[PDB]
């Protein structure tokens, strides 16, 4: 498995607009539509992205397209960032996926702030990096996801990924 | 169903 299935486990999936934990309108696999409080604003952003009158509801193929765009944006973010790019360059593909997941969640600037953990990863110090990453605010606030992401950094394997909707 | 989650 791969970055796409990983983020599927970590982000959920909606075919109808919903409010994320911060109260923002979202659809698909964690695709933020707007930070405006207006549902009509969110729908106009969605209609613009999709090129039709969606009424807040998208198809699976449309969700998939937004998702691939957002994954590509996470990678562009890494590649543009002078702290992230050399770490990423040095990582194997599995650990690269873990870095992309973090950027997907919190943005390049957030991930770039993990200065010590990034140096540890650059030095292949996997256990130290995992220990250090678990000290963070991120880990405390989203531990289910952060544990899995951290195990992926630690092991370089997909082992951590191996109701309430429908 | 038809919508997603998880709630
Ligand atoms: C939905 O969750 C159910 C309850 O856990 C599962 O039984 C069911 O298999 C799940 N369905 C899917 O994951 C398939 C939906 C296809 C979504 C693909 C769109 C994304 C954007 C690639
Ligand atoms: C979806 O809900 C299930 C059941 O509570 C939970 O295990 C899983 O972590 C949830 N996924 C996300 C992305 O929140
Ligand atoms: C699961 O339940 C919530 C009800 O709170 C809905 O918002 C959602 O669309 C889904 O039906």
Residue A36 sits in a domain whose CATH number is: 1.10.530.40
Q: How many folded domains does chain A comprise?
A: 1
Distance between CA atoms of residues A75 and A139, nearest Å: 22
Q: Is A20 a catalytic residue?
A: yes
Q: Which residues span the domain enclosing A84?
A: 1-162
Determination technique for this entry: X-ray
Which residues, judged by CB distance below 6 Å to any ligand atom, belong to the binding site of ligand 1? A 13, 29, 60, 63-64, 67, 166
Q: Is A70 a catalytic residue?
A: no
Write the CA distances from B2 to A37, A46, A60, integer angstroms.
Answer: 25, 19, 10
Distance from CA of A163 to the nearest CA of B (A): 8
Resolution, expressed in angstroms to one decimal: 1.9
């Amino acid at each position: 498995m791969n970055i796409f299935e990983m983020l599927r486990i970590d982000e959920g999936l909606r075919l109808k607009i919903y409010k994320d934990t911060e109260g923002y309108y979202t659809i698909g696999i964690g695709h933020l539509l707007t930070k405006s409080p207006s549902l009509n604003a969110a729908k106009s952003e969605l209609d613009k992205a999709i090129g039709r009158n969606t009424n807040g509801v998208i198809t699976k193929d449309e969700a998939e397209k937004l998702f691939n765009q957002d994954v590509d944006a996470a990678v562009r973010g890494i590649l543009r960032n002078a702290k992230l790019k050399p770490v990423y360059d040095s990582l194997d593909a599995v650990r690269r996926a873990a870095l992309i997941n973090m950027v997907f969640q919190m943005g390049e600037t957030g991930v770039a702030g993990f200065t010590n953990s990034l140096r540890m990863l650059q030095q292949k110090r996997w256990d130290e990096a995992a220990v250090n990453l678990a000290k963070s605010r991120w880990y405390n606030q989203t531990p289910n996801r952060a544990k899995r992401v951290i195990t992926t950094f630690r092991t370089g394997t997909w082992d951590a990924y191996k109701x309430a909707x429908x | 169903x038809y919508x997603x989650x998880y709630x």
